[PDB]
Amino acid sequence: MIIPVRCFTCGKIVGNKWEAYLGLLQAEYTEGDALDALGLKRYCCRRMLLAHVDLIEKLLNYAPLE
Amino acid sequence: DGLAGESVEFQNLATLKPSNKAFEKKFRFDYTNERALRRTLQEDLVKDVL
Amino acid sequence: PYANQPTVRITELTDENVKFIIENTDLAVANSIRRVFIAEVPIIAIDWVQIDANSSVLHDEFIAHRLGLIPLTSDDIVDKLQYSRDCTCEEFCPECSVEFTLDVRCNEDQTRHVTSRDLISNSPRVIPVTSRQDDILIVKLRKGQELRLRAYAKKGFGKEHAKWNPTAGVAFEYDPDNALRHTVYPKPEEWPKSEYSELDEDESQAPYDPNGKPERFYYNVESCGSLRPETIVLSALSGLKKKLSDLQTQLSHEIQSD
Amino acid sequence: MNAPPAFESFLLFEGEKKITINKDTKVPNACLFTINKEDHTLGNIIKSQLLKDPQVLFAGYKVPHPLEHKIIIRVQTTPDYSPQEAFTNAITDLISELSLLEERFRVAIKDKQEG
Amino acid sequence: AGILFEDIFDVKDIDPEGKKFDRVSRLHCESESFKMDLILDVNIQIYPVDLGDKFRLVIASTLYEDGTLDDGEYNPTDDRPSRADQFEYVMYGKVYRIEGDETSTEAATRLSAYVSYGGLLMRLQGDANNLHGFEVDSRVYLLMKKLAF
Ligand SMILES: [Zn+2]
Ligand SMILES: [Zn+2]
Numbered sequence: 001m002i003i004p005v006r007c008f009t010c011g012k013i014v015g016n017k018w019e020a021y022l023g024l025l026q027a028e029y030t031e032g033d034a035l036d037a038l039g040l041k042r043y044c045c046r047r048m049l050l051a052h053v054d055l056i057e058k059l060l061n062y063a064p065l066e
Numbered sequence: 067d068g069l070a071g072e073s074v075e076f077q078n079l080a081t082l083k084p085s086n087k088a089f090e091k092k093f094r095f096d097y098t099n100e101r102a103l104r105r106t107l108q109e110d111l112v113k114d115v116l
Numbered sequence: 117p118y119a120n121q122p123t124v125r126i127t128e129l130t131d132e133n134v135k136f137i138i139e140n141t142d143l144a145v146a147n148s149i150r151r152v153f154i155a156e157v158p159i160i161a162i163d164w165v166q167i168d169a170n171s172s173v174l175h176d177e178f179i180a181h182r183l184g185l186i187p188l189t190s191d192d193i194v195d196k197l198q199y200s201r202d203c204t205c206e207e208f209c210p211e212c213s214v215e216f217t218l219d220v221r222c223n224e225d226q227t228r229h230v231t232s233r234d235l236i237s238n239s240p241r242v243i244p245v246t247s248r249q250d251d252i253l254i255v256k257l258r259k260g261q262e263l264r265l266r267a268y269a270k271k272g273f274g275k276e277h278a279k280w281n282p283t284a285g286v287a288f289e290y291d292p293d294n295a296l297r298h299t300v301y302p303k304p305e306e307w308p309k310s311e312y313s314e315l316d317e318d319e320s321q322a323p324y325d326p327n328g329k330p331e332r333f334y335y336n337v338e339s340c341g342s343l344r345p346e347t348i349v350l351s352a353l354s355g356l357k358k359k360l361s362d363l364q365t366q367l368s369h370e371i372q373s374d
Numbered sequence: 375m376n377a378p379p380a381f382e383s384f385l386l387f388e389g390e391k392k393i394t395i396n397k398d399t400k401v402p403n404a405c406l407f408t409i410n411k412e413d414h415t416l417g418n419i420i421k422s423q424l425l426k427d428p429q430v431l432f433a434g435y436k437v438p439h440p441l442e443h444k445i446i447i448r449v450q451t452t453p454d455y456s457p458q459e460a461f462t463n464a465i466t467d468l469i470s471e472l473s474l475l476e477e478r479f480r481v482a483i484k485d486k487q488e489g
Numbered sequence: 490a491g492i493l494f495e496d497i498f499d500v501k502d503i504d505p506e507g508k509k510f511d512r513v514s515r516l517h518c519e520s521e522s523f524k525m526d527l528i529l530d531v532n533i534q535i536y537p538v539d540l541g542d543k544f545r546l547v548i549a550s551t552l553y554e555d556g557t558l559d560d561g562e563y564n565p566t567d568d569r570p571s572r573a574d575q576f577e578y579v580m581y582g583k584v585y586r587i588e589g590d591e592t593s594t595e596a597a598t599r600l601s602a603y604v605s606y607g608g609l610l611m612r613l614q615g616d617a618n619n620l621h622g623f624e625v626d627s628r629v630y631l632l633m634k635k636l637a638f
Contacts, residue, residue, distance in 0.1 A: 002174070005185035005252055011340055012284035013187060013245075015252035019229075042285065056256055059173040060227060065260040101594045117427040119467035124479045126486045136479070144422035145471070151415045201385075276380045326535050346483050353476040357469055359416055363409065364465045366392035371458050374395065428566065452566055 001055040009044035021049050120145075126346075133284075133338035134345040139331050143290065146333040150288045152352040155275035156359070159282045159342050160190035160197070160242050162216060164208070164268040171261045172230075179255065179263065184279045186232050186244050186252050187342040188214075188269055193242050194343075195351075200270040208268050214242045216267040222257035230254045230263060242269060245341035282343045287336035293322035296330065383443045384411050395458065404432070404450035405457040413437065417445040423464040429455045491550035491558075493622035493629065494613070497521045497636070499543040513609060518544075525615035531633075532609075536578045538635070547576070547632040548604075548613070550622065561628055572632060580631035582606035587625050589617065604629055 003018040017038050024034040031050070040046045081089060097103070103112040122141040126134060138146055165180040172179070193214070203212035215238045222228035231251035232244040244252070255263065274281030291298065292310035301307055304320040312334055315322060339345040386392065390410050398404035409416065417435040424433035432450035449457035498518035508514060512534040518527040527546070531538060538544070551558050552571040573579045584604040589597035600620035602613045611631075613620065623629070 002182075002255070003253060005182055006340075010285045011278070011281050012338075013252065013340055015182075015185075016231075016250040018253065020250055056173060060256060060258045062173075063258055063260070064171065099594070105594065105596075117429065117463070119471040119474075120426075122471065122475045122478070124475065124482045126479075126482045129483070129486045136482070138475070141471075141475075142419075142422045142426075144418045145468070148415050148419045156415075201381075275384060324534065346479075349479060350476060350483075353472055353479065356415075357472040357476070360419075360465050360469050360472070363393065363412075363416065364462065364469075367407075367462065367465070370391070370393055370395055371462075431564065431566070 001059070003052055003054070004048060007042075007045040007048050010042060012040075012042075012045050014040070014045060014048045017049060018052065018054070129346065132345060133336060134349065135334070135336045136349075138333050138335065141331065141333070143330045143333070146290070146330075147288065149352055149356065150286055150335070152356050153283055153286050153337055153348055154281060156273050156355045157282050157343070157348055157351050158190070158194050158271050158273050158355075159280045160188045160194055160214060160269045160271060161277075161279045161342075162186065162188070162267045162269050163200075163272065163279075164213075164270070166266050168264040168266070170263055170265070172255045172257055172263055173261075174255050179265070180267075182254055183218075183235075183265075183267060184277070186235070186254075187340050188237075188242050188244050189247065190242060190271075190342055191344065191347065193239070194271055197271045199272070208270075210239075212270060214239050214269040216269060217265075218254075218267070219264045220257065221262040222259055225259060228257040230257060235267075282340060282348050284338040284340050285336075286338070288333060290330045290333045292334075295322040295325045296328060297324055298330075383413075386411055398448065398450075401450060403453055403455075403457065404448065405461075407447040407449070407461060409445050409447070411443050412445050413443065414445075417447060419468055420447060420461070420464050423468045424449060424460055427451075427460055427464065430457075430460050433460075490554075491556040492547060493550055494546075494548040494619060496523055496525065496546055497543060498525075498527055498546050500538055500540050503538070503540055518546075520615075523615060523619050525613060525619065528610070528612040528614075530606075530609040530611065531578065543636045543638060544633045545636060547572070549630045549632055550628075552579075552630060573630075576632040576634040578631065578633045580606040580609070582609075582611070582629055582631065584623055584625055584627055584629055587620070587623060606631065 003015055005015040006012060007014050017040070021034055021038055024037060025031060029037065035046050035049060038049075040049065081093065084092065097115045100112070100116060103115065107115070120140055120142065122145075123139045124136055125139070126136045128135040162183045165183055167176055167179070170176050170179060174182075197214075198212045200208070200212050203209050205212065208215070217236045217238075218230070218234050220228060220230050220234050231253050233246060233251050234254075235244055237243050257263065272280040289310070289312065292312045293315050294301065294304070301321065307320070309315065309317075337345050337348055339348060343351070392410055394408040394410075396406045396408070398406055414437065417437070421433050421435045424430050429452045430449060431452060432448065435445050435447045437445050447461070449460050451457050451460050498520050500516050501519050502517040504514040505517060506515075512532055513530050514533040516527070516529045516531060516538060518529065519525070520527070521543075549572060550556070552573055553559065553569055554572060582604045584602055586601075586603040588601040588603070590599045591597040597617050600615060600617045600623075602620050602623040604611050604613070604623075613623075
């Protein structure tokens with residue numbers, strides 16, 4: 001739903017990389033070259049950002065007010 | 067037979083199926099061969115059976 | 117019958133990881149340090165969250181959980197605080213805790229990224245890792261939703277909860293060429309070379325070395341931000357040495373009292 | 375709901391002893407140390423340190439159940455050496471070695487940093 | 490003493506049927522003086538033997554020269570001078586069988602003591618005089634050592 005704070009396996013903070021990683025993919029980087037420009041080497045940490053599906057963007061569409 | 071099943075096992079009957087000569091030279095106990103009995107029995111038993 | 121004289125050699129030291137080599141030690145001592153890096157090294161982490169208003173789309177416990185996993189720079193504090201269960205106080209103290217505070221309301225039209233910039237601490241030195249690179253997203257609020265809470269950070273180690281685990285990943289390794297044949301390859305050439313392999317590209321594994329023990333344990337300790345990667349080590353050595361001294365005191369009491 | 379609280383792996387209850395020596399009766403000169411609220415971190419360094427003692431004839435450790443936080447260390451020595459002092463000397467020098475490893479790691483840091 | 494046997498052998502065939510294990514290989518030695526067979530399994534990894542090697546193989550009943558007949562437990566801290574100090578491969582086993590060419594009347598001429606060294610078998614198939622101190626179920630040592638001639 002929202003990017004986990006840490007990689008489940010490793011312990012490494014991946015919570016601050018979802019916006020940076022969606023911005024690099026918007027730029028032109030391929031998805032494997034975005035993941036190490038962010039500094040994610042182990043493939044344990046790399047599936048946090050590849051596999052993440054962001055649902056909170058859909059849950060924010062249901063405004064309580066306005 | 068009057069026995070419970072937790073204690074019986076699988077054995078083999080030795081006297082079924084050898085043949086009428088292999089049965090004899092295996093279950094017979096000759097007491098005549100003096101040399102062979104000093105191999106099996108001690109000296110003071112080989113006179114008692116001989 | 118006695119001790120061994122280990123020697124250390126740092127090969128790489130950055131502010132995110134240390135690679136060192138320890139020589140002349142037993143495999144048990146070298147692996148037990150590895151476990152002390154992961155569990156028993158104290159660190160500060162949010163552990164008490166009182167939620168005053170939460171109207172985000174996330175839970176109440178989803179916020180508190182994501183707040184415990186935010187790493188806070190413990191570096192000289194963490195050795196001055198006390199454990200919460202040992203403070204002779206009632207309801208947290210500046211001497212056993214650090215108080216945080218998040219107050220966010222989305223009033224604008226765009227969505228709000230509640231990040232860890234919003235967690236305001238009361239000590240200037242225990243802050244989330246923002247000092248000198250984005251910030252750990254906590255929620256995203258919409259127009260009219262909010263979050264006020266106050267939270268408390270106390271001292272602990274990774275044996276209670278993983279949130280108090282100071283490392284990203286510890287890379288222990290010994291004997292890169294299969295010299296001891298501690299592992300037995302069915303086809304030794306399908307195996308890539310270690311990073312540390314003092315072997316040519318011709319041969320596959322080192323020839324078997326019958327009388328020989330492990331030494332030269334290669335480590336690569338990587339921090340998560342909370343402690344500096346050479347303070348994780350200096351603290352695991354002291355934390356282990358202190359488990360042992362305590363065991364020895366309790367032992368001498370058991371011996372003299374029998 | 376039947377989950378044990380996580381501080382139960384390191385916090386000693388009220389009445390529990392840290393360590394507890396029991397003379398073993400099957401063989402002469404053998405004891406069993408039972409450490410509470412410990413695991414393979416402390417049990418493995420002591421055993422490997424005791425196997426360096428030449429006067430120690432047996433050393434081992436077990437963890438009887440992993441859901442329970444207790445190890446047993448069985449030491450047997452030669453008749454001129456009690457296992458009470460084998461276990462003590464296995465800690466004294468394990469401490470001396472960890473303290474020396476700390477001094478050396480510290481000077482190697484301050485030489486790596488600008489050096 | 491306690492030397493149940495003593496001889497010089499030389500490896501005549503190493504694992505012949507193919508290598509079944511990886512640290513253990515069958516040596517099919519033959520003797521030199523008493524003209525005995527041997528089928529031995531050695532730890533080919535910590536004591537490697539190649540073909541045409543010659544070794545002196547002393548099967549002993551004890552290790553201490555005075556023949557004081559130890560118990561069968563392992564105690565490394567021991568001062569007493571042993572026979573293992575002049576050999577390179579010592580094993581410790583248990584003779585598990587003694588086959589022979591007995592007939593029903595006259596005695597046997599060729600014996601075969603099969604001893605088993607913790608799992609690693611051996612068969613000393615010779616003639617019935619050198620195989621005398623061997624009786625089934627008795628503890629025995631191996632003591633071999635390669636001759637560099
Ligand atoms: Zn990871
Ligand atoms: Zn307090």
